[PDB]
Structure formats: structure tokens, C-alpha cells
């Protein structure tokens, strides 16, 4: 018979399976869609997570209650030494991708 | 007289000062020369709501809080005012007569330096201190032996 | 080909006030039961055969366990793509005051007093991101450009920082600099001993 | 923003540090940490707890009578903003800090004669 | 002997502060507001027997007199003689002051 | 409430993308590409 | 010159505004309509400042002042104090006070000559009020209310008080102030006069719910407009007031 | 219009249904027993809870007998559970306390004893006008 009191299911099925990632480095699954009219630019970068700290922001958000006021916000620091470009990979389009 | 009727007489009663004196009012002279605002007037005064409508509407327009600041120099109106310096509050040290007090402090510093306020100053004492340190080490070794046994 | 063998800094790719995406693997938790893995309700006290469980994993056909039922297993160490993270500052490593602001005039760097806990010091260029990111300390982070043109005013806002905390995260730190700690504390015994 | 001070121990209290107790008579008590807050809730006396600035001032181990300590106060009458005044206030602030450090060292050596 | 020592530090078990008690001793108006926040019919002894120093109500005059001989009352007296810790003393500990012009 | 997949919401977002966020991101892209071109030719 | 207005569809104008004979303070909102009402009435005759007090928007009840001075409570920040000082000219003295009853707009009501205060304010607070505002200070209640600033609107011309104020109390308070006093209501029968309106010597702003008879009472007692006086209440407007408030 | 106010930032809710709070006005009631919270959502087994500035429905357990037979709207003005403001301050009061109002937010009593929170004062102008101290 039917469930007496309705409740949404625990957890999302979009993030299945809940297994370990196949690689330690994160994989860029999709890059931004290319526009040949734009100037050339790199789409990504790498860094190392160092930790978190606290800031005070002078907020400029018209319509908000904290408009023209100071807000305390948490931030994350990512150490970003410069990368070195060492290669070039070309990709063609096939009916298999 | 009923309670409702008495409340009505309380509402229509006008209390006045008993000496008949009137307080002096302070109405500026430009109020008489003011022209009344009319929405249908093509030459009406432009309002902040009109500027807001012309610049994105409510919730988008960002008002300038420093536009009506009356400073000694108008170039200073958009400065970043210092607040924190080396773990101290700048507003705590803001004082209009700061230079006189700083001059008094510097004169006091010169007087103290002349009087020798900051000045800074035996081999037998060093030898007896070293010998006492050796004796304390020997006592510690003896106590460690006793603890072991 | 022109970029071959050359170093590319972060500020030639990203900019302050830009909203980006962060890709990384999450914190590992090991084998975890259903209560913390899926957020299910605990059974009452002294329930037979355990209470950190789902009471009925199947009451209905098919004669199988379904893939939608919560089960114990690996939690964390998952690949996550998180979007819409605002860049508050791109600090330069050679700047000796890259944690200073226009209203806080203390010449200080981003590294907290005593260093970042279990990391060390940040001596290079750094990105300051509002909020939190999927990874942990020491972990590789992939910062990506947003896939679409943004739709919020938060992506259009420009950030004005008044202050950045540089006190110790190894405890209840109350001082932003060692000079500030010394000035509050005063002269110690070892100061006269030296 | 501004730097506050802990009611119990007197340490600097930066934003988002500690906790504030709002009492029903109208008084706020800012604490820099849970240690000070929990000692307050246990009703310990900061004047008797030896790690507090209150105890140190009561015992005479802090320099109190000094001309360099008169430059910092809660200013209840504001001053119209002046760029030259603010810059010279910063310079005076640095000079006052240096002079205060020297006089504090002299005070400590006079204690430890 | 403290009743229910486990939850003594909860906010719902909080007792009156020593500086508030000092202000009660100095000014009867502040004590009058504090007693106005109570209900006399629920008070021990109908609120007639009250020690300001301990901020405590007692069931009888003999009970109050007997309480005055105990060491908690004398501890409160010694604390009040030493003085209560206040915001002004907290200011003086760090050498801060208020400038009103 | 209108869903995130609603046609009117999509059209409003498209107008915002075309008229407001687009020029700002184009100017930022111009600056970043100029800097990275300077690195590439140096 | 009595104008009905609203701050974000609220009729409590005195909650969000402070009006003296030398400046106006308005709460910072999400739009400029409330500021524009005061700007249309005062075309740069006196300054208008968009203020925040302790991070809040209830500035009419958190602040008190007159044409000579301004008082703000102890929770006002240094930056709000600096903004107020930079917006107001040097003829006005601004002071932050350490009064325990920090709702200064509720505990203080004042014109350019006298002030009435909550009876439990500190003596140092009373002395600071008398110095900065340049007024004589009395401790008073209106119909057994200690929040005099929220239960009376006061000007140099006259005053409007709580409707349940007795005639004897009206006479005594009118002797003490030196201005004519009238008991009446605002915002369709509300007795929170100070929370409901702001007034100075030539302009009053009330809520949109203020009905026409009580608006005419306000204009008569504060002498707003040509030929406005408190005698019209008991001679010319008596029938209207009796019919409306019976 | 239901009594849940708009423009209220998220804060920790310290008072669930079944809490007895103090009565901070002079309406004659001495305590308020919370039976419902305005604006509470739907979740299995979750107790509806409120914080400072929230409207609740309450019954009087102690006070005048004329108030004991009715369910009154009330606004929470003080709570003891610590909560954070947008300026970063975590703060708490020494008690839980509210004031009886109508659905339009106007106060039943004429005075407020003790201070009220900034959230309650900013969301309810009548409480702001009747507040002696705002903290
Ligand atoms: Zn502390
Ligand atoms: Zn006793």
C-alpha cells in the first residue's frame, strides 16, 4: 500500500556511483564553447589549495539589506605558481567524437 | 458628561502656555523663495528618483554616499580613509590638536634622553654563578641516581 | 608554439571579480554507514541489529535490492565540479603587502602567523576565492572559465576588501603580526635574558 | 571597521573573533575567545586570574602612567575628514608606538633590577 | 552542594551578576526594576525576606538571619568589598579612555 | 514559481547575457588576451 | 505643508526619518522614493543625509537632535559617525553618547528650546543633552508613557501628543514647553505620534494612512500653510473633529 | 497577509515548538508557550522553530486569566541560542522573550521591558517605537 507521509528521497541520484574518483587530479569534462571572433585565450589553470581565512568586504549590492555595509566572509586561498607551457595537442571531429 | 464625550472634549481642547509667550521659530529665508514642486512642470527640479530611473531603476542604481560631503578640499571627497594601521585604530588617534601633543612628547623624549632615562649599564660573580650552576647539576645527577635505585 | 617553454602566470588567465569554476577531488572519508553517507534517520535506541541503518531496504517487488536504496560504502574522494566562485583578489608573490588593503595599511603577506596549518607559507601568486572549494589542503585545484555568460549581478559586482585576517589558525589567534603580538605582550623574561 | 578589546582578558578582538553576551540591563560583553567566555559564565574574576590584563594592571606589572598612553581614546565627537590630518596621524602613530616600546622596556628593567 | 551541577553553566540557569548586585546596593531604583521583573506571589516568603548581596529570596526572617551566618554570604561580602569587575576597569586595564570633548 | 527551465526565464536570461554581462566579459577577455599575447611575443 | 509619505509601504515615517530645522536624516533604502519626498519638500534648503545607525535602518528612533546638535547612541560605528560629520556643516555639533537607554529617538524629544526625556536617563546624559542641544531638560511622561520621543511630535510652533492625554496634563506640559499642545492621532487612529510622523517649523511628513481630519489637526497645531493656527481646532474644525473622533 | 516578514536574513533558530519564553511587554501575560511558527516549511518529523524577529503563535501559561483562553500572535525579541549577524558577530541574550502583537504587527501592550534585538526592531516598526534599548 501507499506511503502514508510523503518525504523526498535521501541524496541525489545525479552523483552516482559514490565511488572513489578514478584519478587524483580533477578532470575538466567540458571546456567553454569556442568562438573564433574572440581573441585567443587559455581556458583553465592549476593551483594548490593552501587554506582558508576571513575578510571584511565593503558591500555594494543595491537592493540587499547589507548594502553599503561591512560583511564578514570566508575565503579560500589557492597558491598559484606560474605554469610552464610544454606542448600542443590537436583534435579533429569524427562521427565517433 | 460620558466617557466618550469627555474623550472628544480632550481631543478638541487646545492647551496654551499660561504666560502667553511664544517660542521663537527658526525658518530659513529660502523657504519663502522656494517654488513648489509639480510633477507636470517641464522645468521641475530633477529628483534622486528621476536619476535612479534614468540609471537602471531601483535595485540596480548605486547611490553615491560621498556626493554631498562638505570637506575643506573637494578633491578629498573620494579618498580611501585609513582605519587600521599596525594593529591600532586610526580613529582612536584622530585628534585636531595632534601636533602640539606630539611636540610635547618629543620635548619630553629629548629631556629624558638628556637626563639619562634610557641609559644601560664582575668576573668573581660570574665565576661563583658558574660554580653554583655546576653544584646544581651535581645535585640533579645525585637525585637521578636515587630515583633510579 | 609561441608559448612553448614559457611561464604563464595566473593573472594572465583570470582576473579579479571574475566568477570561475573549481574542479577537484573531495575529502576522503573511507567506508561510511548510511546515516552519514546518505543522511538517513537513526532508528530508536537499542534497536536490534543496530540503529545506524535503514530498517527496510526492500518491502516490495522486485525480489531484489534496488539501486536507489541507501547502502554503506565509500564516502568522499569524489570528483566534483563546483561553479560560480567569485575571485576576490589575485595577489602577487613578489608583493610584500599582498594582504594589505586601502583602509588597512599594515604591510603583511597572506600567510597567517605560524603558517598555514599543514601547508606552509604562500610565497607565490595566490587566488582568493569567496566561499569554499571541493578539495583539501595541499590538493591540486583546476580553475576553469565559466561555460556560459553569467546571469547574476554578483558576477558583475566589483569587490572592495577592507581587511584580510592573518592571525594564527593554529588556535585562537588575536594578533595579525608578530610585531603586534610583541607590542601587546610587552617585554618577556627571555628578552632581558638575551 | 575597528579593533575591539576583550572584556575579560583585554586581548585585541578582531572581526568574527569571539562572542558577545547581551545582558537584559542593556550592557554588551565582547569576548575574544571561548576561554574568556566560559570563565565569565563560571563567574571567575579577571582581576584574580593572573593571565589577564586586569590582573596585570591591578598588580602593577603594566606601564599605565605614561604620556604615550594618552593618544588613544574613544572619540565621541567626530572630526571632519582631512587628508593631511590623517597622514600626520599615521606618522604620529608610528612614532608613539616606538616611544612606547622604549619606555615599556625601561619599565620592565626597573621591575627586574 | 550545587543542585544539578551538570547544567550549572546553561544560560537558563544563570544567576545575577556581581556588578548588577553592586548597582542594586548603590541605587534602590535598579533593585526595584529587578524586583518588578519578578512575581511576588511565586517568590519564597512572598518576597518579604531578600538578601541583596546574594540576590536571594528566603522563606522566613529566621532563614535569612541564619543564611547571614554562612560562608556563601561572607564570600559575597568579601567579593563586594574587593569590588566588581566592570567595563571601566576593563578600559583602565588596557589604558583606554573615553573622550567626550 | 517559474522553473529554472521555464521559457520566459530562459528568454530573460538571454536578454541579460546579450545586453549586460556580455560587454563586461568581452572587455575582460580583451585585457586578459592582451596580457597573454604580451607574454607570448616576449 | 503636511505631506503624506511611505517608507517601503510603511506608514511609520518617524521610525525612518529625523527632521530638524537645520538638517534631515533618512534611512538608506532599496530605492530613492523616500529620499525624493523630502528632497521635493526641501529643495536644498537644509541638507538631507542617507544614514545608517548600528547597521540598522531605524534611524528616527535611534537618533535625537534639533537645529543645534545631533546625538547618536553608543553602538554607532566610526564610519557612520564620519559620514554624518562629513555630511553636516560645522554649525551642528554631533556627539555619540554612552546612554544605557540607547533608543535616543524614543527617550528624547526636543525642539530648539527645550527637551523632554525618559525619567531614568543618566545625569551625565542629561548634562550632555543640555550642552550639545543647547536646551533646558525636564523629566516627563505623556499618559504614563516614558518613551516621550515616540509618543509626542514637537516643534517650535507647537506639539501633538498622545490622544489619551488628560486636559490637565496637556495644560501642565504646555506651561512647561511654552508651545500650544493638542492631543490627536496619526495613521488612522494610532497613538504612536513620534513613530508616525516628523515635523519641523515649516514641514510635517506623516504616513499615508493619516486621515484628512487628523491631518488638518496637525496643520493647525504646527502652523503649516497660510492661515494655520491652533484656534481652528476649537473654533473652525470643532464639528469635523467631534464627528470624526466620537 | 500572513505574518512571516520579508527581507530577513538567515539566522540560527533557537526556539522550537513547545518552548516557554518570557513575556517582555505589559499586556498582563508573564510567559508565552509556542505552539506554531509563521512561515515554517514542511519536513518529516522536524519541529517548527523560530528566532529573533519571527512571528509565532503562543498561548499564555502564566498571567491574567483573560489572556489564558486565546492563541495570540507574538514576535520573538530575545533568544539565548547564539547566532551570527552579517558583520560577523556571534551574539546571544540571557533569556528568550517575545511580545504579543496583532497580525498587522502592532503591539498589544504599551511598553517593552528590557532590550530587543536588531532583527525584531528592523522588521517590526511598532516594536522599534516601543523599544527602550536596541542591541
Ligand atoms: Zn579574551
Ligand atoms: Zn546573603
Numbering used by the authors:
A (entry chain LB): 2 to 98
B (entry chain CH): 357 to 477, 482 to 509
C (entry chain LB): 197 to 390
D (entry chain CQ): 1 to 113
E (entry chain Cb): 2 to 102
F (entry chain CO): 2 to 43
G (entry chain CN): 1 to 246
H (entry chain LV): 5 to 139
What does the paper say about this structure?
The rixosome defined in Schizosaccharomyces pombe and humans performs diverse roles in pre‐ribosomal RNA processing and gene silencing. Here, we isolate and describe the conserved rixosome from Chaetomium thermophilum, which consists of two sub‐modules, the sphere‐like Rix1‐Ipi3‐Ipi1 and the butterfly‐like Las1‐Grc3 complex, connected by a flexible linker. The Rix1 complex of the rixosome utilizes Sda1 as landing platform on nucleoplasmic pre‐60S particles to wedge between the 5S rRNA tip and L1‐stalk, thereby facilitating the 180° rotation of the immature 5S RNP towards its mature conformation. Upon rixosome positioning, the other sub‐module with Las1 endonuclease and Grc3 polynucleotide‐kinase can reach a strategic position at the pre‐60S foot to cleave and 5′ phosphorylate the nearby ITS2 pre‐rRNA.
(A) Close‐ups showing the colored density map of the partly processed foot structure of the pre‐5S rotation‐lacking Utp30/ITS2 state. Superimposed models of the pre‐5S rotation state (Arx1/Nog2 state) indicating the missing parts: Utp30, ITS2, the C‐terminal part of Nop15 (aa277‐335), and Nop53 (aa85‐107). However, the two events, 5S RNP rotation and ITS2 processing, are not strictly coupled. On the other hand, we observed partial or complete removal of the foot structure in particles prior to 5S rRNA rotation and in the absence of a tightly bound rixosome indicating that C2 cleavage and trimming can occur to some extent even before the rixosome could interact with the pre‐60S and trigger 5S RNP rotation. This could mean that there is no strict sequential order of these events, but that also branching and parallel maturation pathways are possible in principle.
